[PDB]
């Protein structure tokens, strides 16, 4: 699952 | 610049 | 450290040059030197620190995942090289965590910066957890959870529910619950509550804030869809 | 050295893993260690060595160009940081040239290896010339010219005009003439005669050799059509 992209 | 061999 | 003899303002200037040159290890080293001067960071500087180390650790995580995939499909060489990358990644995370504990978190002068740094502490323990095993992994998981939970407590008291830093914290903490702590029900509950509490206030925001907040809300939604 | 206790085959295996992980600094270090075992490199191994250092120096060159452009448009910080990147670039080129002179360039050897390494020596002196100034630049330029010229003489005697190594040497030597040595007329002539002499011999090649040769011929043509 992706986390915050920055 | 002019490109050189890419490898 | 190696940056001890350079002026703080020069380190910030060179971090920005390094970013332009896509030299992220240099950027991170300059920002570490700036943090070690002992003064608080502005919002722009905090973001520079985060971008620099995210690029460094992100490359190491991607390489670790490539090598772990080859290892799982598979002499000792693949394991050895995976372990080499792993040790380097752990070193970078220990460096970031050391900056946050000495002394960014305790010197943060406002709630937003304190939440930003406690979230970052949770994130870097989470990166450690991805490669940890056994009892060390269990300790790391508890450390991540404690940092994230402290950030959550502050953000609920001090920041509105649409605040982008608060939303991003909840996004990453919910990812931690799902991907690391094997707690999908906690992940879903947190993402859902965060999404609903932000939605209630969307009509009070400007055009820009609405975009900012729904952007991260959409990131919560993607995870909920994958999870639900 | 840090690789001295590792088996040659393990170094080569790890160089290949490093390439898959896009860890080119590691890849180059593994291949350096392999070279230092003192055995000739196979064709595949020469290509690994070349790809590794190409990517390392390529990132440094790109960063140097960014910083040099900022410097030309413009405290001491931009110059200092450009100088730092420049010194690291020169260090890598000196490492490569050292490996070539101490281990790899021999009077013995097949034409394929001798031309490959002399071309490489020309290339890494060319990269030093890109950042050099004044009389130092003149000497470096002559070192590159001498290496390329020796490779050219061997290639014309010992290889067919379609040989891909011969073609890539002519491509890079013509780039040297155009970009470094202020000799665009020579660059154009070399690219044209090389292309034409390869064209005329394509009929001797298999489907596979034809694709290998024509891909490099296409690069020569791209430069010719750019320059004329
Ligand atoms: N991620 C956390 C801190 C750096 C990075 C920020 C970000 C980028 C894209 C999407 C979400 C967060 C970030 C980087 C550079 C400038 C501004 C940034 O966001 C600051 C506040 O937004 C969360
Ligand atoms: N460049 C010089 C030697 C390594 C690299 C080779 C190359 C790649 C792409 C375009 C031209 C040359 C190369 C790398 C890996 C495998 C095979 C390779 O080329 C062999 C023929 O070189 C002329
Ligand atoms: Cl290793
Ligand atoms: Cl510097
Ligand atoms: Mg030994
Ligand atoms: Na051995
Ligand atoms: Na043209």
């Amino acid at each position: 699952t992706p986390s915050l992209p920055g | 610049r002019t490109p050189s061999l890419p490898g | 450290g190696a940056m001890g003899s350079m002026e703080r303002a020069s380190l910030i200037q060179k971090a920005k040059l390094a970013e332009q040159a896509e030299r992220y290890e240099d950027m991170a080293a300059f920002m570490k030197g700036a943090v070690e001067k002992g003064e608080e960071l502005s919002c722009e500087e905090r973001n520079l620190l985060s971008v620099a180390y995210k690029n460094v650790v992100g490359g190491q995580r991607a390489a670790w995942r490539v090598l772990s995939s080859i290892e799982q499909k598979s002499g000792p060489e693949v394991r050895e090289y995976r372990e080499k990358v792993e040790t380097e990644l752990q070193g970078v995370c220990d460096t970031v965590l050391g900056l946050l504990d000495s002394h960014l978190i305790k010197e943060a002068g406002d709630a937003e910066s304190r939440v930003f740094y406690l979230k970052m502490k949770g994130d870097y323990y989470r990166y450690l957890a991805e490669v940890a095993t056994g009892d060390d992994k269990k300790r790391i998981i508890d450390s991540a959870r404690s940092a994230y939970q402290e950030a959550m407590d502050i953000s609920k008291k001090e920041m509105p529910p649409t605040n982008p830093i608060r939303l991003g914290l909840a996004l990453n903490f919910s990812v931690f619950h799902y991907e690391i702590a094997n707690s999908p029900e906690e992940a879903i509950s947190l993402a859902k509550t965060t999404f609903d509490e932000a939605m209630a206030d969307l009509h009070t925001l400007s055009e820009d804030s609405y975009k900012d907040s729904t952007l991260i809300m959409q990131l919560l939604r993607d995870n909920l869809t994958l999870w639900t």
Side-chain angles (χ1 to χ4, degrees), chain A, chain B, chain C:
Chain A
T1 310
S3 60
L4 194 69
Chain B
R1 279 222 199 268
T2 307
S4 60
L5 196 67
Chain C
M3 299 301 174
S5 64
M6 204 184 309
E7 290 279 17
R8 192 184 188 279
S10 298
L11 288 162
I12 299 297
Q13 181 185 4
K14 291 178 183 182
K16 293 172 185 174
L17 293 170
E19 183 178 35
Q20 293 182 261
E22 299 183 284
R23 291 274 294 199
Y24 292 103
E25 294 183 26
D26 288 347
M27 189 190 179
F30 291 138
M31 288 310 300
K32 173 175 185 291
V35 169
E36 287 171 354
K37 301 299 179 183
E39 299 177 39
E40 279 182 69
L41 305 193
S42 66
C43 179
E44 178 182 2
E45 292 168 344
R46 290 197 295 273
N47 288 337
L48 288 169
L49 176 71
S50 179
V51 165
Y53 278 107
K54 181 56 174 298
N55 276 92
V56 175
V57 82
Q60 295 169 319
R61 290 167 79 204
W64 186 91
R65 290 170 181 177
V66 164
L67 296 172
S68 289
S69 176
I70 295 165
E71 186 181 11
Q72 285 150 217
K73 289 177 57 171
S74 74
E77 290 85 355
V78 183
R79 173 181 57 73
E80 287 169 352
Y81 185 51
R82 188 268 298 159
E83 285 173 352
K84 177 192 180 81
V85 175
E86 185 174 299
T87 300
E88 293 188 16
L89 179 163
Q90 290 166 329
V92 172
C93 293
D94 287 348
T95 291
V96 171
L97 289 165
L99 296 173
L100 298 168
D101 286 327
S102 299
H103 297 280
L104 288 166
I105 292 168
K106 68 171 68 52
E107 290 187 356
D110 58 293
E112 192 161 82
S113 67
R114 193 173 167 90
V115 167
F116 178 102
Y117 292 133
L118 285 160
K119 176 190 156 295
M120 192 165 185
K121 182 175 174 166
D123 291 333
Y124 279 82
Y125 275 117
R126 174 161 59 82
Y127 306 150
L128 288 172
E130 294 176 341
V131 308
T133 59
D135 299 329
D136 179 57
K137 184 178 183 180
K138 294 171 173 157
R139 288 184 292 266
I140 290 164
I141 288 174
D142 288 345
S143 292
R145 185 185 296 100
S146 290
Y148 281 134
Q149 186 60 54
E150 187 177 356
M152 287 292 297
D153 294 347
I154 296 165
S155 74
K156 289 187 175 164
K157 301 220 165 154
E158 300 285 355
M159 302 162 63
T162 51
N163 178 284
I165 293 169
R166 179 170 166 178
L167 292 174
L169 164 62
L171 173 74
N172 282 9
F173 194 14
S174 69
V175 167
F176 165 83
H177 286 312
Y178 194 90
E179 290 294 341
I180 305 295
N182 202 18
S183 306
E185 280 289 277
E186 291 182 281
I188 294 164
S189 296
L190 175 57
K192 169 55 171 178
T193 292
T194 301
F195 182 97
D196 282 11
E197 296 188 344
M199 183 173 286
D201 292 353
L202 282 184
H203 70 275
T204 71
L205 306 181
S206 65
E207 58 185 33
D208 289 354
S209 288
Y210 182 89
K211 296 289 176 295
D212 289 352
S213 299
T214 54
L215 178 62
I216 306 172
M217 289 179 63
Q218 250 302 325
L219 302 181
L220 291 170
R221 175 53 52 196
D222 292 340
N223 296 359
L224 282 167
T225 299
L226 299 178
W227 302 343
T228 67

Short mmCIF file of all heavy atoms in Angstrom, two decimals, chain C residues 3 6-7 9-11 13-14 17-18 20-21 23 25-27 30 59-60 62-64 66-67 70 75-78 80-81 84-85 88:
data_model
loop_
_atom_site.label_atom_id
_atom_site.label_comp_id
_atom_site.label_asym_id
_atom_site.label_seq_id
_atom_site.Cartn_x
_atom_site.Cartn_y
_atom_site.Cartn_z
N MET C 3 30.17 18.50 8.23
CA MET C 3 29.65 19.80 7.87
C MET C 3 29.80 20.84 8.97
O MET C 3 29.33 21.99 8.81
CB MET C 3 28.17 19.69 7.49
CG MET C 3 27.92 18.76 6.29
SD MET C 3 28.80 19.31 4.78
CE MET C 3 28.44 17.96 3.67
N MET C 6 30.96 24.51 8.12
CA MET C 6 30.25 25.30 7.13
C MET C 6 29.10 26.07 7.77
O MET C 6 28.36 25.53 8.60
CB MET C 6 29.70 24.42 6.00
CG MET C 6 29.50 25.22 4.75
SD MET C 6 28.75 24.34 3.36
CE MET C 6 29.75 22.89 3.27
N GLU C 7 28.96 27.33 7.37
CA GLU C 7 27.84 28.16 7.82
C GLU C 7 26.50 27.48 7.54
O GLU C 7 26.30 26.88 6.49
CB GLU C 7 27.86 29.51 7.10
CG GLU C 7 29.01 30.44 7.50
CD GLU C 7 28.73 31.18 8.79
OE1 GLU C 7 27.82 30.76 9.54
OE2 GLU C 7 29.43 32.19 9.05
N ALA C 9 23.71 28.90 6.66
CA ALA C 9 23.07 29.41 5.46
C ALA C 9 23.71 28.83 4.20
O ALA C 9 23.02 28.61 3.20
CB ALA C 9 23.11 30.94 5.43
N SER C 10 25.02 28.57 4.25
CA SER C 10 25.71 27.94 3.13
C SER C 10 25.25 26.51 2.94
O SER C 10 25.12 26.04 1.81
CB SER C 10 27.22 27.99 3.37
OG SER C 10 27.66 29.35 3.43
N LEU C 11 25.01 25.79 4.04
CA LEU C 11 24.52 24.43 3.93
C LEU C 11 23.14 24.39 3.28
O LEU C 11 22.87 23.52 2.43
CB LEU C 11 24.48 23.79 5.31
CG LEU C 11 25.87 23.46 5.90
CD1 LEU C 11 25.82 23.26 7.40
CD2 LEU C 11 26.43 22.21 5.24
N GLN C 13 21.88 26.65 1.22
CA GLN C 13 22.07 27.00 -0.18
C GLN C 13 22.57 25.81 -0.99
O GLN C 13 22.10 25.55 -2.10
CB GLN C 13 23.05 28.17 -0.25
CG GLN C 13 23.33 28.67 -1.63
CD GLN C 13 24.39 29.75 -1.64
OE1 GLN C 13 24.97 30.07 -0.59
NE2 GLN C 13 24.68 30.29 -2.82
N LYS C 14 23.54 25.07 -0.44
CA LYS C 14 24.09 23.90 -1.14
C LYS C 14 23.09 22.74 -1.17
O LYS C 14 23.07 22.00 -2.15
CB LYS C 14 25.41 23.46 -0.53
CG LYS C 14 26.52 24.47 -0.79
CD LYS C 14 27.82 24.06 -0.13
CE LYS C 14 28.89 25.13 -0.33
NZ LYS C 14 30.18 24.78 0.25
N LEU C 17 21.12 23.57 -4.21
CA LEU C 17 21.90 23.25 -5.40
C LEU C 17 21.94 21.75 -5.66
O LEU C 17 21.81 21.31 -6.81
CB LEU C 17 23.32 23.78 -5.26
CG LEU C 17 23.45 25.30 -5.24
CD1 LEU C 17 24.90 25.70 -4.84
CD2 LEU C 17 23.08 25.92 -6.58
N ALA C 18 22.15 20.96 -4.60
CA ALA C 18 22.20 19.52 -4.75
C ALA C 18 20.88 18.99 -5.28
O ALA C 18 20.85 18.11 -6.15
CB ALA C 18 22.58 18.88 -3.42
N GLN C 20 18.81 20.61 -7.24
CA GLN C 20 18.76 20.93 -8.66
C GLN C 20 19.59 19.96 -9.49
O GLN C 20 19.24 19.64 -10.63
CB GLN C 20 19.25 22.35 -8.90
CG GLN C 20 18.33 23.42 -8.34
CD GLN C 20 18.83 24.82 -8.64
OE1 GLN C 20 19.45 25.47 -7.81
NE2 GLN C 20 18.58 25.27 -9.85
N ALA C 21 20.72 19.51 -8.93
CA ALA C 21 21.62 18.59 -9.60
C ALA C 21 21.23 17.13 -9.41
O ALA C 21 21.94 16.25 -9.89
CB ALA C 21 23.05 18.83 -9.10
N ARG C 23 21.42 15.40 -6.77
CA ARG C 23 22.46 14.79 -5.94
C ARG C 23 21.90 14.65 -4.53
O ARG C 23 22.22 15.42 -3.62
CB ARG C 23 23.71 15.68 -5.98
CG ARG C 23 24.44 15.71 -7.32
CD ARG C 23 25.43 14.59 -7.46
NE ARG C 23 26.50 14.78 -6.49
CZ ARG C 23 27.70 14.22 -6.56
NH1 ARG C 23 27.99 13.42 -7.56
NH2 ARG C 23 28.60 14.47 -5.62
N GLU C 25 22.10 12.31 -2.07
CA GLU C 25 22.97 12.02 -0.93
C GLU C 25 23.66 13.28 -0.44
O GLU C 25 23.74 13.52 0.77
CB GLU C 25 23.97 10.92 -1.26
CG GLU C 25 23.30 9.58 -1.51
CD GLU C 25 24.26 8.45 -1.77
OE1 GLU C 25 25.41 8.51 -1.29
OE2 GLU C 25 23.83 7.48 -2.42
N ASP C 26 24.13 14.12 -1.37
CA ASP C 26 24.72 15.39 -0.97
C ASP C 26 23.68 16.27 -0.29
O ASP C 26 23.97 16.91 0.73
CB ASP C 26 25.27 16.18 -2.16
CG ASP C 26 26.54 15.60 -2.75
OD1 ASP C 26 27.19 14.72 -2.13
OD2 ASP C 26 26.91 16.04 -3.87
N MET C 27 22.48 16.33 -0.86
CA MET C 27 21.42 17.15 -0.31
C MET C 27 21.14 16.76 1.14
O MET C 27 20.99 17.62 2.01
CB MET C 27 20.15 16.99 -1.16
CG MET C 27 19.06 17.97 -0.79
SD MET C 27 17.55 17.48 -1.67
CE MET C 27 16.41 18.74 -1.08
N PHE C 30 24.01 17.83 3.47
CA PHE C 30 23.96 19.25 3.76
C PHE C 30 22.86 19.57 4.76
O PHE C 30 23.06 20.35 5.69
CB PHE C 30 23.75 20.04 2.48
CG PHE C 30 24.94 20.03 1.52
CD1 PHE C 30 24.73 19.89 0.16
CD2 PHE C 30 26.24 20.22 1.95
CE1 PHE C 30 25.80 19.91 -0.75
CE2 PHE C 30 27.29 20.23 1.07
CZ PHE C 30 27.06 20.10 -0.29
N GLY C 59 15.56 5.05 -2.67
CA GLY C 59 16.40 4.28 -3.56
C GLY C 59 16.89 3.00 -2.92
O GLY C 59 16.95 1.95 -3.58
N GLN C 60 17.24 3.07 -1.65
CA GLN C 60 17.71 1.88 -0.94
C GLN C 60 16.58 0.87 -0.76
O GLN C 60 16.78 -0.33 -0.91
CB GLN C 60 18.26 2.27 0.43
CG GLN C 60 19.47 3.12 0.38
CD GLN C 60 19.80 3.65 1.74
OE1 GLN C 60 18.90 4.06 2.50
NE2 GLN C 60 21.06 3.64 2.07
N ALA C 62 13.96 0.51 -2.71
CA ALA C 62 13.67 -0.10 -4.01
C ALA C 62 14.71 -1.16 -4.34
O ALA C 62 14.38 -2.25 -4.82
CB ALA C 62 13.60 0.99 -5.09
N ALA C 63 15.98 -0.86 -4.07
CA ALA C 63 17.04 -1.84 -4.32
C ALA C 63 16.88 -3.07 -3.42
O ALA C 63 16.99 -4.21 -3.89
CB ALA C 63 18.40 -1.19 -4.13
N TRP C 64 16.56 -2.84 -2.15
CA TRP C 64 16.33 -3.95 -1.22
C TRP C 64 15.20 -4.84 -1.71
O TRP C 64 15.29 -6.07 -1.65
CB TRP C 64 16.02 -3.40 0.17
CG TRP C 64 15.91 -4.45 1.25
CD1 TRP C 64 16.91 -4.91 2.04
CD2 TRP C 64 14.73 -5.19 1.61
NE1 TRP C 64 16.43 -5.87 2.90
CE2 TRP C 64 15.10 -6.08 2.64
CE3 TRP C 64 13.41 -5.19 1.17
CZ2 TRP C 64 14.19 -6.94 3.24
CZ3 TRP C 64 12.51 -6.04 1.77
CH2 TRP C 64 12.90 -6.89 2.81
N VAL C 66 14.19 -5.26 -4.85
CA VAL C 66 14.66 -6.00 -6.02
C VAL C 66 15.45 -7.22 -5.57
O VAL C 66 15.22 -8.34 -6.02
CB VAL C 66 15.49 -5.10 -6.95
CG1 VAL C 66 16.31 -5.93 -7.96
CG2 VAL C 66 14.60 -4.05 -7.65
N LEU C 67 16.39 -7.00 -4.64
CA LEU C 67 17.27 -8.07 -4.20
C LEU C 67 16.52 -9.11 -3.39
O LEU C 67 16.77 -10.32 -3.53
CB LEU C 67 18.44 -7.48 -3.40
CG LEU C 67 19.35 -6.57 -4.21
CD1 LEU C 67 20.35 -5.88 -3.28
CD2 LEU C 67 20.08 -7.29 -5.34
N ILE C 70 14.76 -11.39 -5.83
CA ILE C 70 15.68 -12.36 -6.43
C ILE C 70 16.02 -13.44 -5.42
O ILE C 70 16.05 -14.64 -5.76
CB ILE C 70 16.93 -11.63 -6.93
CG1 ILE C 70 16.59 -10.67 -8.07
CG2 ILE C 70 18.02 -12.63 -7.38
CD1 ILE C 70 17.69 -9.68 -8.37
N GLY C 75 24.24 -19.93 -4.34
CA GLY C 75 25.26 -19.50 -3.40
C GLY C 75 24.77 -18.42 -2.45
O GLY C 75 23.63 -18.01 -2.53
N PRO C 76 25.67 -17.95 -1.59
CA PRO C 76 25.30 -16.95 -0.59
C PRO C 76 25.28 -15.52 -1.12
O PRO C 76 24.92 -14.62 -0.37
CB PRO C 76 26.43 -17.10 0.45
CG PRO C 76 27.62 -17.44 -0.40
CD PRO C 76 27.06 -18.40 -1.43
N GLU C 77 25.66 -15.30 -2.38
CA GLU C 77 25.91 -13.94 -2.84
C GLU C 77 24.66 -13.05 -2.80
O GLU C 77 24.77 -11.86 -2.48
CB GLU C 77 26.48 -13.98 -4.25
CG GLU C 77 27.91 -14.51 -4.34
CD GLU C 77 28.02 -16.02 -4.41
OE1 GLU C 77 27.00 -16.74 -4.31
OE2 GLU C 77 29.18 -16.48 -4.57
N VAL C 78 23.50 -13.56 -3.21
CA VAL C 78 22.30 -12.72 -3.23
C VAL C 78 21.97 -12.28 -1.81
O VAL C 78 21.68 -11.10 -1.54
CB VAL C 78 21.10 -13.44 -3.88
CG1 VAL C 78 19.90 -12.48 -3.94
CG2 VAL C 78 21.44 -13.98 -5.30
N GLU C 80 24.05 -12.10 0.73
CA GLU C 80 25.08 -11.18 1.21
C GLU C 80 24.84 -9.77 0.69
O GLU C 80 24.96 -8.80 1.43
CB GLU C 80 26.45 -11.69 0.77
CG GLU C 80 26.94 -12.91 1.51
CD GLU C 80 28.14 -13.54 0.91
OE1 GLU C 80 28.57 -13.15 -0.20
OE2 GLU C 80 28.64 -14.46 1.56
N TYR C 81 24.53 -9.65 -0.60
CA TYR C 81 24.37 -8.32 -1.17
C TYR C 81 23.08 -7.65 -0.67
O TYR C 81 23.07 -6.45 -0.36
CB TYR C 81 24.50 -8.37 -2.70
CG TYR C 81 24.46 -7.00 -3.33
CD1 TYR C 81 25.27 -5.99 -2.86
CD2 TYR C 81 23.61 -6.72 -4.36
CE1 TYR C 81 25.23 -4.72 -3.42
CE2 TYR C 81 23.55 -5.46 -4.93
CZ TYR C 81 24.36 -4.45 -4.43
OH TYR C 81 24.30 -3.19 -4.95
N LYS C 84 24.00 -6.30 2.59
CA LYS C 84 24.79 -5.08 2.48
C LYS C 84 23.88 -3.88 2.27
O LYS C 84 24.04 -2.83 2.93
CB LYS C 84 25.76 -5.22 1.30
CG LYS C 84 26.60 -3.99 1.02
CD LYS C 84 27.30 -4.13 -0.34
CE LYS C 84 28.18 -2.93 -0.71
NZ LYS C 84 29.50 -3.01 -0.03
N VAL C 85 22.93 -4.00 1.34
CA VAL C 85 22.01 -2.89 1.10
C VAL C 85 21.17 -2.64 2.35
O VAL C 85 20.92 -1.49 2.73
CB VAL C 85 21.16 -3.18 -0.15
CG1 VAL C 85 20.11 -2.09 -0.36
CG2 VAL C 85 22.06 -3.29 -1.41
N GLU C 88 23.04 -0.62 4.90
CA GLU C 88 23.11 0.79 4.51
C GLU C 88 21.79 1.51 4.75
O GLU C 88 21.78 2.62 5.28
CB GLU C 88 23.56 0.88 3.05
CG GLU C 88 24.98 0.40 2.90
CD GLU C 88 25.56 0.64 1.54
OE1 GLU C 88 25.00 1.45 0.77
OE2 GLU C 88 26.60 0.01 1.26
#
